[PDB]
Design a protein around this ligand. Structure first.
Ligand SMILES: *CC[C@H]1/C(=C/c2[nH]c(/C=C3N=C(/C=C4\NC(=O)C(CC)=C4C)C(C)=C\3CCC(=O)O)c(CCC(=O)O)c2C)NC(=O)[C@@H]1C
Ligand SMILES: C=CC1=C(C)[C@@H](Cc2[nH]c(/C=C3N=C(/C=C4\NC(=O)[C@H](C)[C@H]4CC)C(C)=C\3CCC(=O)O)c(CCC(=O)O)c2C)NC1=O
Ligand SMILES: C=CC1=C(C)[C@@H](Cc2[nH]c(/C=C3N=C(/C=C4\NC(=O)[C@H](C)[C@H]4CC)C(C)=C\3CCC(=O)O)c(CCC(=O)O)c2C)NC1=O
Ligand SMILES: C=CC1=C(C)[C@@H](Cc2[nH]c(/C=C3N=C(/C=C4\NC(=O)[C@H](C)[C@H]4CC)C(C)=C\3CCC(=O)O)c(CCC(=O)O)c2C)NC1=O
Ligand SMILES: C=CC1=C(C)[C@@H](Cc2[nH]c(/C=C3N=C(/C=C4\NC(=O)[C@H](C)[C@H]4CC)C(C)=C\3CCC(=O)O)c(CCC(=O)O)c2C)NC1=O
Ligand SMILES: C=CC1=C(C)[C@@H](Cc2[nH]c(/C=C3N=C(/C=C4\NC(=O)[C@H](C)[C@H]4CC)C(C)=C\3CCC(=O)O)c(CCC(=O)O)c2C)NC1=O
Ligand SMILES: C=CC1=C(C)[C@@H](Cc2[nH]c(/C=C3N=C(/C=C4\NC(=O)[C@H](C)[C@H]4CC)C(C)=C\3CCC(=O)O)c(CCC(=O)O)c2C)NC1=O
Ligand SMILES: C=CC1=C(C)[C@@H](Cc2[nH]c(/C=C3N=C(/C=C4\NC(=O)[C@H](C)[C@H]4CC)C(C)=C\3CCC(=O)O)c(CCC(=O)O)c2C)NC1=O
Ligand SMILES: C=CC1=C(C)[C@@H](Cc2[nH]c(/C=C3N=C(/C=C4\NC(=O)[C@H](C)[C@H]4CC)C(C)=C\3CCC(=O)O)c(CCC(=O)O)c2C)NC1=O
Ligand SMILES: C=CC1=C(C)[C@@H](Cc2[nH]c(/C=C3N=C(/C=C4\NC(=O)[C@H](C)[C@H]4CC)C(C)=C\3CCC(=O)O)c(CCC(=O)O)c2C)NC1=O
Ligand SMILES: C=CC1=C(C)[C@@H](Cc2[nH]c(/C=C3N=C(/C=C4\NC(=O)[C@H](C)[C@H]4CC)C(C)=C\3CCC(=O)O)c(CCC(=O)O)c2C)NC1=O
Ligand SMILES: C=CC1=C(C)[C@@H](Cc2[nH]c(/C=C3N=C(/C=C4\NC(=O)[C@H](C)[C@H]4CC)C(C)=C\3CCC(=O)O)c(CCC(=O)O)c2C)NC1=O
Ligand SMILES: C=CC1=C(C)[C@@H](Cc2[nH]c(/C=C3N=C(/C=C4\NC(=O)[C@H](C)[C@H]4CC)C(C)=C\3CCC(=O)O)c(CCC(=O)O)c2C)NC1=O
Ligand SMILES: C=CC1=C(C)[C@@H](Cc2[nH]c(/C=C3N=C(/C=C4\NC(=O)[C@H](C)[C@H]4CC)C(C)=C\3CCC(=O)O)c(CCC(=O)O)c2C)NC1=O
Lengths: 177, 164, 172, 375, 177, 146, 146
């Protein structure tokens, strides 16, 4: 869709302005921490299965009404549905982190997601909790602060990208809220 | 739009899979080519209405017939429209120099160009004359660096091929 | 509870300091915008019913799981509890607006509110949505120029939006 | 007519003359798709009888076109070769689309736009996106109906989904590309008594697909979901949100004041002095038509409601930005000679000489003065 | 769809009445000026490209806000869109003039055209002007008083058909209003 | 009972009625750029669209008045209480007079065929009786918003 | 109480009031080309537009004075302190008198119907009482900027 380089040309196209050296240094900074974003996306997608299975089970074990009959995560088919319903969310947040802006998950994954879960009868505040656990796991991973498994990195700062993946995860919260 | 990143995310999305190792392998190619194309972009940007002045007139030098009555250039305001028409193409080439792909060229100048210029009697030969005159006037040593002129000319002759 | 004058008075007392002249400069410019401060709380107060009712109406138009059967606003008494919960926050934000700081908002409105909603099973994120829907409704109304002299009051509008933000993150 | 066993006519790709007809039908898509366990099974050419393979074609690619025995001999000439094994069901549903009996109620009876939606619903089982219609009206109006119906059958979506031996049907695919193309598909395909013939226009997805924003209503895309995927929600709660919908789905109620072009009008109390709310913003629409006749010229008048246009207003705000950043005026102590807004103000005089004496009129009004940029 | 001969049978079918010699003379008059309608449709479709390109450029050169960025006819793709958006209108008015009544463009072209232009953001009053210019060009052509190019005809009256194509062109104005 | 000149005069308005409102509201801003300012009354498309609609209403209301040849319908369902709803909505009463006078100056230029951008094709004559009558109608509507 | 001649006299000004300002400012440049010069006061459209507006103001201010038949409104919200704001803006005080006298010489030509480019259609008579009164009004405004 739109990446971070293509975000500034649609802003400059609105004024018929050439992209010049007054706003190019914000792009060159974005290129300068290319390897930091690149290793961070890799650290997200490396341990992504436990990322999903842990988050859905953590959403279950705080609200055990879904396991009761009449729950939305009651039967075996609906649990298989919910385990992928959040894996798609993680799969699109991994796209948005790599692309540099939240345009690829906005119209592809988030457009029409609200009335889908309304018409199906999916409890929205439970999905809020399920994606907040995924946000917490994401900032644990890309800051290398997971107490559960450590990955090797070159030393430095990564919080600028950690706030980015946090700002992607509230958009998934706002769109079904 | 059609950039380097927006093929590797759309391919992984149509396959329905995570960003794999070859997918982040292709964004590394931006780090080596952006240093060549961004400096081409604002050497284009800081010199831009010069290369409409000294190159939008070359079509009128090649095709002086269209200043006749009953032609595409009748009065001065249509010539101003012509200079505006070619300044737009020079802006879109600058947009494609910064994006990394030919994304901003496709749906903003190229898609639909065959219809308008046929219906409004505008000859595409006078467009590609003015673009080609801007293409061959490039010299690595001056104008820009050795690698800036390469894909600066490559984004130009893409437009030349698409208009013809 | 403290207002903005009593706050730096407590600051200066707890180190035994006389108030410097520069702090008297800081208090006189709060005195300077007194009519503009009063002008806002007046506009919020005369529109308080339509703020709460329109924000609540727009909340269930986009979160229809609350008013459908089983939701946490499916009664007439849980619904009347929700409207009156929204009026409470609009009341205490307007108290903090004339106080100058958020002591009375934090102290006797937001203290223990997250735990209350967790004990009741009320979804606090949907409360946070309704608070920001009242926030933009009151902010766009505080930039209305009818009945006021022509001037600048934008920093006070940002201060008013800050209290709604503080109440919004306090209940999630 | 052409071959006793054929694979693919017209040789669009070169690699179809080598391509043999599939000996066994294409399997399910490899995603998991939780709805599919509720939906009835697919109907291929191998498993079906010739009675039910005809019934299922009439139920999917025709909607419920409601066909008699005397109607449509041309469908049955194509059926006379399908039943002989001459052509696949892929080329058979291509031949149904090219037929006149499909034209006379879907290309003919409908409009330019929802014929494309009726083609997507009939052949691919789903609803298109706006950029997919955008490259499709060019095929339809400038290259004709034939290439348009050809563009579905030679498409990769059709080949991958139905193959050469399975009837079209609505497919639940698990992972979808957009999240909106799930419920657009569900909205486009309700269950029994579909009746594409009924609504001359449907007017609802024809404005929801007409822009990438403005996703359609919750209740329309949760209505034809199967039972026990949506029951225990349809006793009394959304039931009156459903019948009040289907009343408006009759007669094709237009969504001009609903979901698109929404405008919060001012309170009625602010204009009680002017007029009643049933007549506010109506204005006479005058069409004066010249022709050199006197027998045949005409004038028409009608009061019409004039909606505010947010598209034209957005363009005007972008244009007037140039005046915002060019200063207003210099000032000084000499402003006391111009006390009010009377800076650069002047009296405008208009003098109305006419043939009648009673209709003569004199003006004076005080107003600002500015010179246009063309002078 | 419905032509002029088929318009009277759906009126007589509403009363179960035979079409008889009391209303047949209005049909025989319509047959009598068959060649006048026939040459008029030919004179419309002969010069139809300048008819479209002149009208859209005349709509542009009175309202030059569409050419500004943010205009609906700003870019090259949208101008290619608008040049055909009115060519379809002329193409259906040519059908309605030949068929003798405004039934073929009402459900085929005009049904659903309003919310299409509303949902896309097409300025309706500009399209009103664009089709009014086409109406003026039409009455210029089929009365043979185009000062710009003259066509040869047999002498006589054609204003009865000129009011017809005028009444077709306000239906395209009313359906978009 | 002026037949043909009246019908030629309304045709010079209702055809080019689409320029006249957009030229007048841009001219309305052209004096006063504090109207599009944050806090102004010609802020975002909630209000700019109602401005275009309102400039169009009072334009047309005059063409039917000119077609009828009298100012009756300009006071029946047009004007009896248009001032107080405008002061209830809080529109600026100053620049509305300017917007009305741009319409006057443009209508009197269209009727007399003295437009620099478009020369109309009329029968030979002089429309001096009708160029002042639309000025009288526009002052009738300008006297209301005052 | 001169009724019809006064109304004929103002009509000969406010109709052709658009030529008179543009002819006068071109005549203002006509002897003094150092005004459009780089460094002059009639440089780019920041200042030339204010010149056209200001030449229009003092033109009209006289037609309402002539309609009222006295110079009261030419001194109330017109003139009491117009000299010092002009010396505060730094306009040349010389060529403004020339611009005012071109308006005088043109108004006295329009009233007496002695224009070489346009012959007006009046009732038979002689407007000698009004041709001098507008000269007295223009003198009043010329005595101010001195
Ligand atoms: C928009 C409506 C949201 C909502 C509201 C809701 N609240 C309650 C219950 C309580 N709310 C409070 C909160 C306060 N009480 C106070 O005195 C103050 C002043 C500082 C506050 C902020 C308390 C104590 C309760 C419990 C007491 C009670 O029962 O009223 C309820 C439930 C009422 C009930 O269960 O009977 C609702 C529904 N809930 C929503 O879903 C909306 C998001
Ligand atoms: C492109 C983006 C994209 C998505 C985001 C998903 C969104 C999505 N989820 C479901 C469908 C579902 N999604 C859930 C998920 C949940 N319910 C809960 O109780 C939990 C809160 C949550 C899991 C964590 C369940 C349980 C169903 C099946 C509902 C049912 O049939 O019982 C469906 C219907 C299709 C089907 O049922 O097979 C769709 C489109 N699919 C997509 O194509
Ligand atoms: C975003 C990308 C973008 C573009 C590339 C241009 C493309 C473009 N050019 C024109 C329009 C035009 N383009 C030209 C240009 C030329 N004719 C000639 O004689 C020469 C061959 C050539 C200049 C060298 C002229 C003269 C017109 C006006 C034609 C007319 O109005 O009849 C139009 C129609 C709208 C208009 O009149 O402005 C469009 C869409 N506009 C865009 O928005
Ligand atoms: C970003 C794109 C870009 C361009 C293509 C040029 C375009 C351009 N070139 C020249 C001007 C020139 N261009 C050349 C050409 C060359 N000079 C050499 O040393 C090489 C041998 C050869 C590289 C092609 C020469 C010799 C002149 C000077 C004489 C002339 O005007 O032709 C001029 C006139 C004044 C000037 O030098 O600027 C302009 C506008 N400028 C730009 O900003
Ligand atoms: C009875 C209760 C009571 C009130 C409600 C206030 C209201 C009030 N405000 C102002 C005066 C003012 N009020 C405002 C406020 C605003 N103006 C705007 O244009 C914005 C819409 C809004 C900003 C929030 C401003 C900005 C001034 C000063 C005028 C200026 O300098 O712009 C004045 C005149 C005195 C002065 O000059 O300060 C009064 C009496 N005072 C009271 O005693
Ligand atoms: C799966 C369940 C299922 C059904 C129940 C029917 C329902 C149904 N009936 C009709 C269509 C119709 N149904 C009727 C029937 C009647 N009108 C009357 O005046 C009587 C009250 C009643 C007969 C007793 C008529 C007359 C039409 C055709 C309407 C017309 O075109 O005039 C259509 C439109 C399709 C078409 O017209 O071919 C459909 C879907 N079809 C189904 O697939
Ligand atoms: C476009 C041109 C066109 C045609 C000419 C026919 C040709 C044709 N006929 C049959 C099919 C047939 N045709 C016949 C006809 C006959 N057998 C006899 O003994 C008699 C000599 C003769 C009748 C006079 C019979 C009996 C069958 C069916 C064979 C069977 O199943 O027993 C089939 C197979 C399709 C089906 O069986 O439904 C086709 C394609 N169809 C076409 O579409
Ligand atoms: C069967 C009948 C039939 C029609 C009448 C047209 C109607 C029509 N027009 C457009 C689409 C359009 N139509 C216009 C036209 C205009 N906008 C303006 O500013 C001018 C007023 C006007 C030209 C004179 C434009 C500019 C678009 C594209 C909008 C955009 O993407 O920017 C679309 C969307 C499809 C697409 O964008 O490709 C459709 C269905 N098509 C049909 O099939
Ligand atoms: C709805 C149908 C309809 C019309 C549009 C008008 C068109 C029209 N006007 C006139 C005829 C005329 N029309 C005008 C009008 C004008 N002359 C000018 O120079 C000005 C531009 C304009 C005044 C604003 C004049 C002055 C005459 C001649 C006197 C007269 O017949 O009234 C005639 C008689 C023949 C002719 O001269 O062409 C016709 C048909 N009349 C109609 O029945
Ligand atoms: C930036 C500030 C700004 C303004 C002050 C106005 C500029 C403006 N132009 C006209 C004047 C006019 N406006 C039109 C209207 C049109 N001409 C046409 O041919 C089209 C059909 C139609 C839409 C453009 C006409 C015909 C005139 C009279 C001729 C002229 O003065 O150009 C007038 C009224 C007479 C006058 O006092 O000059 C004004 C105020 N527009 C602005 O943007
Ligand atoms: C029969 C005669 C008739 C009219 C004249 C209009 C009059 C009119 N205007 C508005 C209402 C309005 N009209 C305007 C328009 C403007 N405000 C300004 O400062 C400028 C003068 C102008 C833009 C240039 C605005 C801004 C609103 C109010 C929109 C709002 O803020 O609620 C309303 C309230 C209803 C509504 O808009 O929803 C009415 C009835 N309507 C009619 O039926
Ligand atoms: C607003 C409406 C209105 C007007 C425009 C004037 C128009 C006007 N002037 C006069 C009548 C006259 N008008 C003039 C004026 C002049 N004669 C000249 O040669 C000079 C050109 C000009 C002086 C500058 C004279 C001298 C008379 C005759 C004496 C008189 O009645 O005053 C009459 C009476 C009948 C007639 O003679 O036509 C009328 C209606 N009066 C009005 O009520
Ligand atoms: C290059 C230097 C330059 C100038 C010195 C002035 C030239 C000029 N012309 C007139 C004089 C005039 N100017 C007009 C005005 C007009 N005539 C009309 O018919 C139109 C309606 C209107 C706008 C053209 C009239 C009516 C006269 C008096 C008749 C005449 O002397 O031509 C006067 C005043 C009398 C005089 O002293 O001659 C001057 C100074 N213009 C210049 O460009
Ligand atoms: C009620 C009576 C009344 C007037 C007479 C005018 C008077 C007037 N003129 C100017 C202001 C001005 N007026 C002029 C005009 C000129 N300078 C010259 O050298 C020439 C004499 C003339 C052009 C031919 C210029 C150049 C400015 C100042 C513009 C600037 O540089 O800031 C200003 C300052 C406000 C502003 O323009 O923004 C005012 C109030 N306005 C009124 O309200």
């Amino acid at each position: 869709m739109l990446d971070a380089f293509s975000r500034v040309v649609v802003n400059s196209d609105a004024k018929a302005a050439y992209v010049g050296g007054s706003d190019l240094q914000a792009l060159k900074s974005f290129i300068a921490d290319g390897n930091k974003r690149l290793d961070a996306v890799n650290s997200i997608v490396s341990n992504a299965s436990c990322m999903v299975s842990d988050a859905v089970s953590g959403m279950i074990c705080e609200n055990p009404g879904l396991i009761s009959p009449g729950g939305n995560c009651y039967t075996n088919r609906r649990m298989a549905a919910c385990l992928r319903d959040g894996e798609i969310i993680l799969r699109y947040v991994s796209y948005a982190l790599l692309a540099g802006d939240a345009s690829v998950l906005e119209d592809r994954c988030l457009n029409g997601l609200k009335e889908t879960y309304i018409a199906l009868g999916v409890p929205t505040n439970s999905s809020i909790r399920a994606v907040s656990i995924m946000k917490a796991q994401a900032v644990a991973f890309i800051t290398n602060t997971a107490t559960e498994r450590k990955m090797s990195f070159a030393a430095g700062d990564c919080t600028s990208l950690a706030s980015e993946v946090a700002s992607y995860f509230d958009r998934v919260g706002a769109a079904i809220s | 739009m059609k950039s380097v990143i927006t093929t590797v995310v759309s391919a992984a999305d149509a396959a329905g899979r995570f960003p794999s190792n070859s997918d982040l392998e292709s964004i590394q190619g931006n780090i080596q080519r952006s240093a060549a194309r961004l400096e081409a972009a604002e050497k284009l940007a800081g010199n831009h209405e010069a290369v409409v002045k000294e190159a939008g007139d070359a079509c009128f030098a090649k095709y002086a017939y269209l200043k006749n009555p009953g032609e595409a250039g009748e009065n001065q305001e249509k010539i101003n429209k012509c200079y505006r028409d070619v300044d737009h193409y020079m802006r879109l080439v600058n947009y494609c120099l910064v994006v990394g792909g030919t994304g901003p060229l496709d749906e903003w100048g190229i898609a639909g160009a065959r219809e308008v210029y046929r219906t409004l009697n505008l000859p595409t030969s006078a467009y590609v004359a003015s673009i080609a005159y801007t293409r061959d006037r490039l010299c690595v040593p001056r104008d820009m660096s050795a690698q800036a002129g390469v894909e600066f000319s490559a984004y130009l002759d893409y437009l030349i091929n698409a208009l013809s | 509870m403290l207002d903005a004058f009593a706050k730096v008075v407590a600051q200066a007392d707890a180190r035994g300091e006389f108030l410097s002249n520069t702090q008297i400069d800081a208090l006189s410019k709060m005195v300077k915008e007194g009519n503009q401060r009063l002008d806002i709380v007046n506009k919020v107060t005369s529109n308080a019913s339509a703020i709460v009712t329109n924000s609540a109406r727009a909340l269930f138009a986009e979160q229809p799981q609350l008013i459908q059967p089983g939701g946490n606003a499916y009664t007439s008494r849980r619904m009347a509890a929700c409207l009156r919960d929204m009026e409470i926050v609009l009341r205490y934000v307007s108290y903090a607006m004339i106080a100058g700081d958020s002591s009375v908002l934090d102290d006797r409105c937001l203290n223990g509110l997250r735990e209350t909603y967790q004990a009741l099973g009320t979804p606090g994120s949907s409360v946070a949505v309704a608070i920001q829907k009242m926030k933009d409704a009151s902010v766009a109304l505080a930039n209305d120029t009818t009945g006021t002299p022509i001037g600048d009051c934008s920093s006070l509008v940002a201060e008013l939006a800050g209290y709604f933000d503080r109440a919004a993150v306090s209940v999630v | 007519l052409t071959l006793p066993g054929t694979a693919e006519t017209n040789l669009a790709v070169p690699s179809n003359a080598v391509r043999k007809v599939q000996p066994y039908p294409i399997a399910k898509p490899p995603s998991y798709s939780s709805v599919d366990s509720l939906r009835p099974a697919r109907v291929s050419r191998m498993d079906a009888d010739w009675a039910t393979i005809y019934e299922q074609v009439r139920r999917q690619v025709m909607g419920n076109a409601y066909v008699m025995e005397g109607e449509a001999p041309d469908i049955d000439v194509a059926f006379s070769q399908l039943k002989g094994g001459n052509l696949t069901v892929r080329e058979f549903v291509r031949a149904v689309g090219k037929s006149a009996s499909y034209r006379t109620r879907f290309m003919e009876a409908k409009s330019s736009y929802n014929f494309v939606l009726l083609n997507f619903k009939h052949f691919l089982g789903r609803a298109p996106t706006q950029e997919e219609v955008s490259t499709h009206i060019q095929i339809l109006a400038t290259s004709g109906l034939e290439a348009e119906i050809d563009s579905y059958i030679d498409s990769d979506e059709y080949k991958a989904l139905f193959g050469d031996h399975v009837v079209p049907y609505v497919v639940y695919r698990g992972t979808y590309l957009s999240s909106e193309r799930f419920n657009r598909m569900v909205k486009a395909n309700p269950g029994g008594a579909t009746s594409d013939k009924a609504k001359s226009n449907l007017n609802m997805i024809a404005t929801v697909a007409a822009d990438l924003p403005t996703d359609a209503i919750d209740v329309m895309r949760g209505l034809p979901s199967p039972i026990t995927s949506e029951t225990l929600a349809f006793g009394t709660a959304y039931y009156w949100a459903k019948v009040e919908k289907e009343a408006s789905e009759g007669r094709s109620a237009s969504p001009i004041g609903e979901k698109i072009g929404k405008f919060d009008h001012a309170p009625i109390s602010t204009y009680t002095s002017l007029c009643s709310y049933d007549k506010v913003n109506k204005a006479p629409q005058i069409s004066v038509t010249n022709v050199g006749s006197d027998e045949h010229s005409y004038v028409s008048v009608t009061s019409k409601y004039i909606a505010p246009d947010m598209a034209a207003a957005a363009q005007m705000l972008a244009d007037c930005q140039k005046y915002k950043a060019g200063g207003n005026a210099p000032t000084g102590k000499w402003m006391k000679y111009y006390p009010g807004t009377t800076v650069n103000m002047a009296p405008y005089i208009s003098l109305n000489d006419t043939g009648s004496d009673s209709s003569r009129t004199v003006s004076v009004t005080l107003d600002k003065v500015k010179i246009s940029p063309n002078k």
